[PDB]
Amino acid sequence: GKGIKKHLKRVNAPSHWMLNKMGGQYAPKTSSGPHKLLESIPLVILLRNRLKYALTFDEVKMILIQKIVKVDNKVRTDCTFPVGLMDVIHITKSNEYFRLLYDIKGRFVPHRITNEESKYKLCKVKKILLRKGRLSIAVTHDGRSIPYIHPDVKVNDTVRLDLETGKVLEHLKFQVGSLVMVTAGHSVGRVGVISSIDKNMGTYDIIHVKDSRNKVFATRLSNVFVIGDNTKPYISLPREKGIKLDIIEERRNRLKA
């Protein structure tokens, strides 16, 4: 048969997973869920190789069995569950909240987040659909189908999502002052306010994004994540603060200690 492959080779694992080459030849294939395998990572490596909480699959699973790991305040027991680009995960008894953000190099790193900001999660919508009764339901990048969205919300506008009530709070547009985050582009990891767009005739629309250091970089429209307006990032950024510090002048920063 040629059915769905139920294995993932270690060498074929995505680069940001960072799997040792000698630690076997199989990678934990993420189960079907809210996000794609390439742009999401499993709790296994999240808590074994990134959090360093566990050292083995068996101990990862016996941590997982207890309802102490919560994503969006929802307990999860799928061992290879795709967390996604942007989400809120919580560990209860030790009372910590991790928001999955990017890194300037372009990896996945959990970021410490308080309860208040954890209650404030953002989802980029993908498309809106009209159903029976002339009602519009919009699907986010998290595979989340939220019905009854604001009429002012557009296809590329992002919407504030509340975790408990599962409701929309406020929409953010794609304006020249819209602070965005490149999701899967070659310039992944750099935050920017966008400088302009170019509406091309039926091809991948590109946008030129302006950095804090006046660096202009072009990336596709299909892989951006509006994270707030020009006032401030609505999401607590990681230590690197979303500024792609250059490779040549990274070594001078690294060498002083």
Partner: protein
Amino acid sequence: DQFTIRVKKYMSNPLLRRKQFALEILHPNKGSVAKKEVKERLAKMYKLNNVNTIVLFGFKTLFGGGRTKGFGLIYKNVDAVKKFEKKYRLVREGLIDKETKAGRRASKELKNRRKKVRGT
């Protein structure tokens, strides 16, 4: 014998109710030291009143002696040890004996047995 104890990467894991830290023992001009002395040393360092709650492994004596690296772990209690530790580690630490040591012979005779050919 007298030796120096170094603890690095000392962190606490509420998920396991444990603590993880890399353990180094400096014993220059002296060979490998028994785990009992370092067990007592770490117990009195961390005010531990019991011995069996600790797990020591990863001990590499390095070249020429004088420094042995290793990994040390602590548990909340014997209950935590039993719940979150596997049989081989338990046997090595010395609490319970191993299960029946047949191994793959279990699967061999499972294949030998056939469905609806044995009354039992």
